[PDB]
Design a protein around this motif. Structure first.
Motif, PDB file in Angstrom:
ATOM      1  N   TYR A   1      94.335  97.804 -53.486  1.00  0.00           N
ATOM      2  CA  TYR A   1      94.017  98.643 -53.991  1.00  0.00           C
ATOM      3  C   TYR A   1      94.037  99.417 -52.274  1.00  0.00           C
ATOM      4  O   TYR A   1      95.138  98.475 -51.582  1.00  0.00           O
ATOM      5  N   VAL A   2      93.172 100.424 -51.916  1.00  0.00           N
ATOM      6  CA  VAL A   2      93.372 101.091 -50.516  1.00  0.00           C
ATOM      7  C   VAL A   2      92.668 100.324 -49.570  1.00  0.00           C
ATOM      8  O   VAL A   2      91.351 100.425 -49.603  1.00  0.00           O
ATOM      9  N   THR A   3      93.002 100.317 -48.114  1.00  0.00           N
ATOM     10  CA  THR A   3      92.649  99.719 -47.482  1.00  0.00           C
ATOM     11  C   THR A   3      92.335 100.115 -45.987  1.00  0.00           C
ATOM     12  O   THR A   3      90.707 100.236 -45.351  1.00  0.00           O
ATOM     13  N   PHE A   4      93.069 101.235 -45.859  1.00  0.00           N
ATOM     14  CA  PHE A   4      93.678 101.406 -44.057  1.00  0.00           C
ATOM     15  C   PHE A   4      92.921 103.043 -44.365  1.00  0.00           C
ATOM     16  O   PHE A   4      92.284 103.115 -43.473  1.00  0.00           O
ATOM     17  N   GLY A   5      93.086 103.924 -45.160  1.00  0.00           N
ATOM     18  CA  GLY A   5      93.103 105.600 -44.936  1.00  0.00           C
ATOM     19  C   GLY A   5      92.468 105.487 -46.180  1.00  0.00           C
ATOM     20  O   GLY A   5      91.048 105.123 -46.321  1.00  0.00           O
ATOM     21  N   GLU A   6      92.362 106.910 -46.465  1.00  0.00           N
ATOM     22  CA  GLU A   6      91.800 107.638 -47.464  1.00  0.00           C
ATOM     23  C   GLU A   6      92.491 107.674 -48.853  1.00  0.00           C
ATOM     24  O   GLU A   6      92.121 107.050 -49.628  1.00  0.00           O
ATOM     25  N   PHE A   7      93.731 108.697 -48.848  1.00  0.00           N
ATOM     26  CA  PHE A   7      94.355 109.712 -49.202  1.00  0.00           C
ATOM     27  C   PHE A   7      95.655 108.044 -49.796  1.00  0.00           C
ATOM     28  O   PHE A   7      96.974 107.496 -49.179  1.00  0.00           O
ATOM     29  N   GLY A   8      96.363 108.160 -51.320  1.00  0.00           N
ATOM     30  CA  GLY A   8      97.242 107.044 -51.496  1.00  0.00           C
ATOM     31  C   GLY A   8      97.749 106.982 -52.481  1.00  0.00           C
ATOM     32  O   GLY A   8      97.785 107.857 -53.584  1.00  0.00           O
ATOM     33  N   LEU A   9      99.527 106.636 -52.509  1.00  0.00           N
ATOM     34  CA  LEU A   9     100.336 107.112 -54.316  1.00  0.00           C
ATOM     35  C   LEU A   9     100.051 105.499 -54.677  1.00  0.00           C
ATOM     36  O   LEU A   9     100.226 104.658 -54.399  1.00  0.00           O
ATOM     37  N   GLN A  10      99.840 106.064 -55.925  1.00  0.00           N
ATOM     38  CA  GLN A  10     100.004 104.482 -56.801  1.00  0.00           C
ATOM     39  C   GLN A  10     101.445 104.201 -57.379  1.00  0.00           C
ATOM     40  O   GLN A  10     101.729 105.275 -58.468  1.00  0.00           O
ATOM     41  N   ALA A  11     101.919 103.325 -57.233  1.00  0.00           N
ATOM     42  CA  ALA A  11     103.480 103.400 -58.190  1.00  0.00           C
ATOM     43  C   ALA A  11     102.997 102.492 -59.212  1.00  0.00           C
ATOM     44  O   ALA A  11     102.126 102.047 -59.759  1.00  0.00           O
TER      45      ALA A  11
ATOM     46  N   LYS B   1     106.006  95.902 -58.850  1.00  0.00           N
ATOM     47  CA  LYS B   1     105.315  96.149 -59.934  1.00  0.00           C
ATOM     48  C   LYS B   1     104.267  97.781 -60.518  1.00  0.00           C
ATOM     49  O   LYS B   1     103.943  98.010 -59.230  1.00  0.00           O
ATOM     50  N   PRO B   2     103.193  97.439 -61.470  1.00  0.00           N
ATOM     51  CA  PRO B   2     102.699  98.408 -61.817  1.00  0.00           C
ATOM     52  C   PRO B   2     101.506  98.300 -60.924  1.00  0.00           C
ATOM     53  O   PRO B   2     100.336  97.413 -61.475  1.00  0.00           O
ATOM     54  N   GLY B   3     100.743  98.414 -60.164  1.00  0.00           N
ATOM     55  CA  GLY B   3      99.597  98.622 -59.374  1.00  0.00           C
ATOM     56  C   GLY B   3      99.745  98.390 -57.641  1.00  0.00           C
ATOM     57  O   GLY B   3      98.127  98.694 -57.212  1.00  0.00           O
ATOM     58  N   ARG B   4     100.971  98.795 -57.182  1.00  0.00           N
ATOM     59  CA  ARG B   4     101.169  98.256 -55.622  1.00  0.00           C
ATOM     60  C   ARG B   4     100.612  99.874 -55.212  1.00  0.00           C
ATOM     61  O   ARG B   4     100.910 100.783 -56.106  1.00  0.00           O
ATOM     62  N   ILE B   5     100.015  99.841 -53.835  1.00  0.00           N
ATOM     63  CA  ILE B   5     100.150 100.731 -53.966  1.00  0.00           C
ATOM     64  C   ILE B   5     100.583 101.330 -52.250  1.00  0.00           C
ATOM     65  O   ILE B   5     101.233 100.654 -51.245  1.00  0.00           O
ATOM     66  N   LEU B   6     101.784 102.022 -52.043  1.00  0.00           N
ATOM     67  CA  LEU B   6     103.000 102.573 -51.112  1.00  0.00           C
ATOM     68  C   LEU B   6     102.959 103.109 -50.440  1.00  0.00           C
ATOM     69  O   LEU B   6     102.333 102.643 -49.206  1.00  0.00           O
TER      70      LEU B   6
END
Ligand SMILES: [Mg+2]
Ligand SMILES: [Mg+2]
Lengths: 141, 57, 94, 82
Positions: free
Chosen positions: A26-36, A98-103
């Motif tokens: 999941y995301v930990t730093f920002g607010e908005f993020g891209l999911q591969a 893999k499917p689930g990282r958050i680049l």
RNA sequence: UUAUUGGAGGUAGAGCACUGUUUGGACGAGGGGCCCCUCGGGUACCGAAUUCAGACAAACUCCGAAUGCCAAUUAAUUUAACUUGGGAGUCAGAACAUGGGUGAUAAGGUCCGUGUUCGAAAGGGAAACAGCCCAGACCACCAGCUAAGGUCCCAAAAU
RNA sequence: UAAUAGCUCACUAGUCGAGUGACACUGCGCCGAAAAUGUACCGGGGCUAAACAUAUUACCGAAGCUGUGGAUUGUCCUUUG
RNA sequence: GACUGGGGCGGUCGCCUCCUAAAAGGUAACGGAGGCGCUCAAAGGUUCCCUCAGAAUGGUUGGAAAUCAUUCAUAGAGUGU
RNA sequence: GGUUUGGCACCUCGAUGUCGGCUCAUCGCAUCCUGGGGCUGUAGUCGGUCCCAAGGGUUGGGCUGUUCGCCCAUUAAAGCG
RNA sequence: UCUGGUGACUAUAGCAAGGAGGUCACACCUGUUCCCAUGCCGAACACAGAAGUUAAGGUCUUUAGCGACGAUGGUAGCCAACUUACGUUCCGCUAGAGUAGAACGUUGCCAGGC
């Protein structure tokens, strides 16, 4: 072509990884993020280009991160050869997805401009994508 | 508790552990059918071949 | 504070994916009140209940006998599907 | 193309056939090996002698039994055939 | 072969406690010049110091499954197991699935493990076909029930 | 907008007298999709089911298995047969 | 002279440790990393005794490098190779 | 796509004759000309780009063994395979 | 079961912090003539003593701040089977790690004093 992102090797030859499946991260730093989401892995060159895009379309500064780094090489050997002999020289570096990282992740902006820049990224990568808000992990302890 | 068995789908193409575990029960040609007293042992010996065998009782 | 419940049998073979497909949800509750319980619950009314009291508010989970007060601990969300699995409750002290 | 020009790393037949050579619940004879190793991947206990390559055996007949000592390191200990 | 008990190792997986990689913060231990002072101020980058969080690994592991492997003065089934002696054949294997290396997450590729079938095995299905799928022909019958796969005509069977 | 004059597509009275919007995971589909002797990867005819999916009862279908007859081996009953 | 992804030139040809090696072992490739073709009269044997690297701070030799000095330091050192 | 340089070593070693040119053609269309169209930073003539379309046509010579290629002079065009 | 010596037990024992006591245990402790001994040194070891003391070591009490233990549930993975060529899916065995809960300031044996 270009390999800015690099490190101390520790070793210059390595058996590959080829992806199977996962979720999470999941995301930990920002607010908005891209999911591969889907079938591929990556080289650094691509990521750089995506960063150029995501830095231009956002003026007002606007913050970006890259949660991943290529820790792995990508070997490919001289042109028009017979097979056999010792594994080839270096051409590339790799950051498997893999499917689930958050680049890519961002904050400091609204909901829109994020979404545009992320469109303008996902056209410039192999993987299909998905847009996400930081509202919840699946664990907080 | 007796138990009538029936072989239905043959052993050909199947690995050997299965195959040996079949012939252990005295299962010759297809549709052959014996009657045996029940145990943890025997039923676990079925469970390895559960698909290609029937159990009537 | 109001949740309609089914009680779970604790051997619900991996076909329980049916439940998760039905909108139903598994969970457990423990701590001070009793030792351990497995339950069912709806996802819909749960995401209502989050906003209702808040994250760590005091829900009265459903049994059929006495409801138990709880201070929801944890859950194991999965991306690519956008939903929750295996909520974690806690029978608090007084 | 072919030949050009490299190592040849690879020194690929290098074997010694280590491991374990008996099991628990196994009657065993004097002088018999139980378990090859190096260093002390297993320690000895009673009725045991070790050698100049950290092998293990049983000085006397009996029955093999492995055990735990300190949450890391095990030991083997024959005990008397009844 | 299975059940039951015990047991050695450290894969998959997970993880950062060593090895090494890494991002953004916190940062203070402190510096470099350009400049002030002229004894100090040092104003972007930083080492390590110490840490918050998030990551990576065949040749990293605080950990660690399924399977398999080794034995049981143990139990059920069952028919095989060993020695000696006489006689040979074989040492060019292929495909399918599967864990992997190499190769370009190319090859009806090559090299290994795992299992099946062909090879040495026809027959039914896959339009047609060595290996895929069901199944192992002692001979004969103008008898029957089923397997895979199929039921409008071709082509037997539900428009 | 050379620049401006802008009925207004900014808001409500007027007609109108119920639907109207935007997202979430989704099944099946469309375009992307251009070859070389003559249709041309449905096997052909042909099909909007005679296609796809779910659930069911029947049935066809091999040298399998079964029934009858015969033969050889070989283990039993047991000279038997 | 053999290997030899046609053959040739190139490279190797024995042994030790790892990984690939699929939680026993074994398990190939012109696959990936390193070595060996010795040394010791003590660095062997045996009886006694002791515990290091790093870190902090004060101090001549001031990369805080040299010995000191305590404290922290679960092995991060050292182990002929 | 399977026209090139390549990888593979599945047919062929008791013989599958290979470069280029002559005569012969035949085909595909990812169109070189004609035919029709859309757009234009198309005023007109000339144009650029995209689409449908393969019915027909697609030249003489110099130069090399020549595919290729350069050049001369033509031509509505002097196609790619 | 008050103390002490010696054994067994997966650190649930520990580690950090604080409170209390000693001439009966033990220790600090006075000293180095002898035993002997320190690579310099009676610091250490050792021998002879018991002047002073509970400060320290060590013992007991309490703490869950650190570390080790740690379920149950559900997840990843995977043995067998069906589909399928899908960075596969569905079904049946099995069952992690991480984590929360909770557990934890040891437990017993033998002798001798008591
Ligand atoms: Mg892994
Ligand atoms: Mg002339």
């Amino acid at each position: 072509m270009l390999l800015p992102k690099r490190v101390k090797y520790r070793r210059q030859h390595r058996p590959k990884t080829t992806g199977r499946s996962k979720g999470g991260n999941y995301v930990t730093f920002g607010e908005f993020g891209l999911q591969a989401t889907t079938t591929s892995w990556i080289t650094s060159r691509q990521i750089e280009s995506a960063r150029i895009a995501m830095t231009r379309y956002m003026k007002r500064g606007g913050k970006v991160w890259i949660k991943i780094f290529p820790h792995t090489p990508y070997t490919k050997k001289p042109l028009e050869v017979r097979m056999g002999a010792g594994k080839g020289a270096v051409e590339g570096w790799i950051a498997v997805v893999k499917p689930g990282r958050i680049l890519f992740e961002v904050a400091g902006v609204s909901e829109e401009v994020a979404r545009e820049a992320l469109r303008l990224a996902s056209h410039k990568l192999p993987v299909k994508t998905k847009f996400v808000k930081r509202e919840e992990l699946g664990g907080e302890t | 508790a007796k138990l009538q068995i029936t072989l239905t789908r043959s052993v050909i193409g199947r690995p050997e552990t299965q195959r040996k575990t079949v012939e252990a029960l005295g299962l010759k040609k297809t549709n052959s059918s014996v009657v045996v007293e029940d145990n943890p042992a025997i039923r676990g010996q079925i469970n390895k071949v559960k698909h290609l065998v029937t159990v009537e009782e | 504070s109001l949740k309609s419940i089914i009680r779970q049998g604790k051997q619900t073979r991996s076909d329980l994916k049916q439940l998760r497909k039905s909108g139903k949800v598994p969970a457990v509750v423990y701590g001070y009140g009793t030792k351990n319980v497995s339950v069912k619950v709806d996802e819909v009314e749960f995401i209502k209940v989050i906003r209702e009291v808040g994250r760590n508010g005091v829900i009265e989970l459903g049994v059929g006998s006495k409801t138990i007060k709880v201070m929801v601990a944890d859950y194991q969300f999965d991306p690519l599907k956008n939903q929750i699995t295996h909520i974690d409750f806690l029978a608090i002290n007084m | 193309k072919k030949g050009v020009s490299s190592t040849k790393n690879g020194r690929d037949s290098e074997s010694k056939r280590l491991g374990a050579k008996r099991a628990d619940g196994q009657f065993v004879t004097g002088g018999s090996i139980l378990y090859r190793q190096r260093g002390t991947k297993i320690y000895p206990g009673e009725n045991v002698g070790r050698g100049g390559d950290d092998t293990l055996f049983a000085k006397i007949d009996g029955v093999v039994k492995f055990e735990r000592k300190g949450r890391d390191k095990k030991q083997v200990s024959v005990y008397a055939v009844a």
